[PDB]
Amino acid sequence: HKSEVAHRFKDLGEENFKALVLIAFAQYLQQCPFEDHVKLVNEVTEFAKTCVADESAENCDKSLHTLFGDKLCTVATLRETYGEMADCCAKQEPERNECFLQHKDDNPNLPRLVRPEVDVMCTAFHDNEETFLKKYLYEIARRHPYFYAPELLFFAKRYKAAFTECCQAADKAACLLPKLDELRDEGKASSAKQRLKCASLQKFGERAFKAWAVARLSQRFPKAEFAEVSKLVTDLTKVHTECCHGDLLECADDRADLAKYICENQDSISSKLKECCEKPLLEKSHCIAEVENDEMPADLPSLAADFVESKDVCKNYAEAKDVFLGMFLYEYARRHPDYSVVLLLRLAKTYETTLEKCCAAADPHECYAKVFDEFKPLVEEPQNLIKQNCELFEQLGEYKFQNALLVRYTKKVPQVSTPTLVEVSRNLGKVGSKCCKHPEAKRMPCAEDYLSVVLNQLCVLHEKTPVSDRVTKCCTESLVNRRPCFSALEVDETYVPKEFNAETFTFHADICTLSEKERQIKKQTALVELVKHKPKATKEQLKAVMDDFAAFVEKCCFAEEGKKLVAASQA
Ligand SMILES: CO/N=C(\C(=O)N[C@@H]1C(=O)N2C(C(=O)O)=C(CSc3nc(=O)c(=O)[nH]n3C)CS[C@H]12)c1csc(N)n1
Numbered sequence: 001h002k003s004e005v006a007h008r009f010k011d012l013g014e015e016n017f018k019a020l021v022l023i024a025f026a027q028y029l030q031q032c033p034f035e036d037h038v039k040l041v042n043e044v045t046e047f048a049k050t051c052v053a054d055e056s057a058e059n060c061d062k063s064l065h066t067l068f069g070d071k072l073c074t075v076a077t078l079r080e081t082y083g084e085m086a087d088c089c090a091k092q093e094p095e096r097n098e099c100f101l102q103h104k105d106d107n108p109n110l111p112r113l114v115r116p117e118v119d120v121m122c123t124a125f126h127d128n129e130e131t132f133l134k135k136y137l138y139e140i141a142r143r144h145p146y147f148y149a150p151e152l153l154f155f156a157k158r159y160k161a162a163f164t165e166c167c168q169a170a171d172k173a174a175c176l177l178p179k180l181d182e183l184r185d186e187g188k189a190s191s192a193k194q195r196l197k198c199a200s201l202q203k204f205g206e207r208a209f210k211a212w213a214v215a216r217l218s219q220r221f222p223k224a225e226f227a228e229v230s231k232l233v234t235d236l237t238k239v240h241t242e243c244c245h246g247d248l249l250e251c252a253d254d255r256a257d258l259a260k261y262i263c264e265n266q267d268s269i270s271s272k273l274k275e276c277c278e279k280p281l282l283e284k285s286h287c288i289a290e291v292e293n294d295e296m297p298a299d300l301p302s303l304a305a306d307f308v309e310s311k312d313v314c315k316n317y318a319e320a321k322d323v324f325l326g327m328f329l330y331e332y333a334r335r336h337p338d339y340s341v342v343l344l345l346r347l348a349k350t351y352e353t354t355l356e357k358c359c360a361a362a363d364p365h366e367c368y369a370k371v372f373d374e375f376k377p378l379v380e381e382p383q384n385l386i387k388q389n390c391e392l393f394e395q396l397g398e399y400k401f402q403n404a405l406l407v408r409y410t411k412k413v414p415q416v417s418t419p420t421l422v423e424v425s426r427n428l429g430k431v432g433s434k435c436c437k438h439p440e441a442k443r444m445p446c447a448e449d450y451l452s453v454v455l456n457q458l459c460v461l462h463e464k465t466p467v468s469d470r471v472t473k474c475c476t477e478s479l480v481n482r483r484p485c486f487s488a489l490e491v492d493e494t495y496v497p498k499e500f501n502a503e504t505f506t507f508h509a510d511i512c513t514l515s516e517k518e519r520q521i522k523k524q525t526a527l528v529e530l531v532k533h534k535p536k537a538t539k540e541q542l543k544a545v546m547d548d549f550a551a552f553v554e555k556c557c558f559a560e561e562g563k564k565l566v567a568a569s570q571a
């Protein structure tokens with residue numbers, strides 16, 4: 001268009017425009033205070049209004065990158081605060097913005113955000129609602145420079161709904177705190193899923209990402225033909241490649257073009273896209289990315305005809321292996337939306353290995369004739385883990401299930417630090433409470449999403465501080481074999497028990513006033529140290545020690561009765 005900034009202002013609207021501009025500047029100038037960014041937003045917005053009134057006005061014909069880069073280089077504190085980022089200003093726009101992207105700090109050293117009191121938040125939300133929501137956008141954008149800015153607007157509007165409803169209820173804290181914990185966890189999980197998917201795209205290559213996209217899209221859109229799914233996978237791969245690069249402009253236009261195409265070909269893709277495609281342009285791609293699974297045609301034949309019993313299995317495979325394997329993934333994924341994506345990739349890799357061996361053997365047809373039998377043990381393994389863990393979760397509670405996982409994982413790998421074993425087991429316990437409530441149709445896909453972000457953060461700290469050879473051996477393994485190995489870990493019999501420290505098991509009455517979360521973490525910390533001290537302790541012996549601890553904590557609310565509890569448990 002003649003004035004691109006005017007076109008953006010008319011499409012997004014003034015409110016969304018200012019919010020997106022605040023996020024854009026906060027992701028590049030992460031160290032500048034909130035008041036400086038509010039001034040920059042008002043200046044860009046006032047300039048955009050001159051272009052809407054007259055697209056032929058001065059500088060209105062410049063590109064968004066030029067206008068943004070020129071405005072980024074007008075900051076007086078650019079040389080002193082960001083240093084090498086000021087050297088980017090001596091380059092032309094094609095190289096200047098790339099120089100800006102290279103200086104985005106994915107891990108800035110900013111202090112933790114502290115949740116204010118409920119009465120303070122509600123008062124602040126009432127006094128100045130706009131700056132309240134803008135402060136949220138500023139703090140999260142500067143801490144996550146690659147966070148998709150429209151998705152950040154999606155969270156900000158949910159905070160507005162949370163404070164609007166809860167600050168007028170009879171009990172504000174009971175209403176607001178569960179919603180804030182939900183928005184906090186989903187926000188941290190969103191940025192964590194983006195970082196993992198971007199890092200996996202650079203390491204494992206584009207082929208592995210397309211294989212993942214084929215499986216997930218075929219589950220999402222089972223009524224679509226393979227040519228349609230393959231066209232969506234190509235566009236989706238291009239979208240993620242650029243969104244991972246950091247250029248917000250190219251990322252958003254790609255997602256806009258993809259959502260526009262999907263909404264224009266609903267009859268060839270899915271029937272569940274009626275609601276998402278009626279939403280505004282800013283919310284299309286985000287909505288489609290979380291659309292519900294469509295129903296399968298139900299008239300789908302078996303896969304043995306095209307992939308097992310046909311005489312041209314090796315011929316069609318030799319013509320284009322990834323296309324043939326992609327068609328195998330497409331057909332298997334559209335028929336099993338209850339499987340996890342990594343499970344479908346597990347079956348595709350098995351079918352790929354089989355064809356490589358069989359198509360070169362003497363009798364290929366007889367060789368891969370029983371390939372589907374290899375898929376059954378691979379499918380039963382996660383299914384039996386879901387039933388085994390959800391049944392154990394049903395007998396116990398969330399806290400008791402977390403303590404059950406603590407003893408299991410401490411015996412298997414006691415070399416891991418105690419706060420890590422506690423934090424991981426608590427998160428794995430929340431995975432069980434969230435996914436075991438779903439029916440079996442959504443249990444395995446639910447577990448995959450939450451386990452992928454928990455197993456990665458377990459090794460996000462273990463890669464910086466290695467302490468176990470078995471843990472780091474399977475976080476360097478393939479992505480489809482990461483979870484199966486963690487389930488295949490065994491008890492370390494060659495582990496000498498840790499020395500008994502009296503100060504470790506020593507407890508004081510200060511834990512009786514602490515919150516429930518604090519008393520649990522303190523009790524769960526001592527449970528790991530007990531297993532590290534006596535890994536050969538039976539489940540019956542361990543329960544007797546835990547039952548005496550719950551009774552001693554109730555009676556002591558000191559050190560005299562604690563000495564008898566240590567000596568009795570040490571026998
Ligand atoms: C910007 O914050 N300032 C606020 C305010 O609104 N705080 C809210 C509160 O308690 N919040 C929560 C959360 O739920 O923890 C959070 C946590 S969400 C989050 N935190 C991270 O560190 C991160 O990396 N990613 N994500 C997604 C953010 S602000 C909001 C405020 C209100 S009155 C006042 N004086 N300050």
Ligand SMILES: CCCCCCCCCCCCCC(=O)O
Binds near residue numbers: 207210322345349480
């Ligand atoms: C039409 C798009 C085809 C995309 C390529 C599909 C290749 C399937 C390979 C299956 C095994 C992959 C395992 C892995 O990459 O981790």
Ligand SMILES: CCCCCCCCCCCCCC(=O)O
Binds near residue numbers: 216259285290291
């Ligand atoms: C979320 C990044 C892509 C945004 C555009 C979405 C286009 C349709 C995606 C369909 C759902 C895919 C979800 C997934 O692959 O995990």
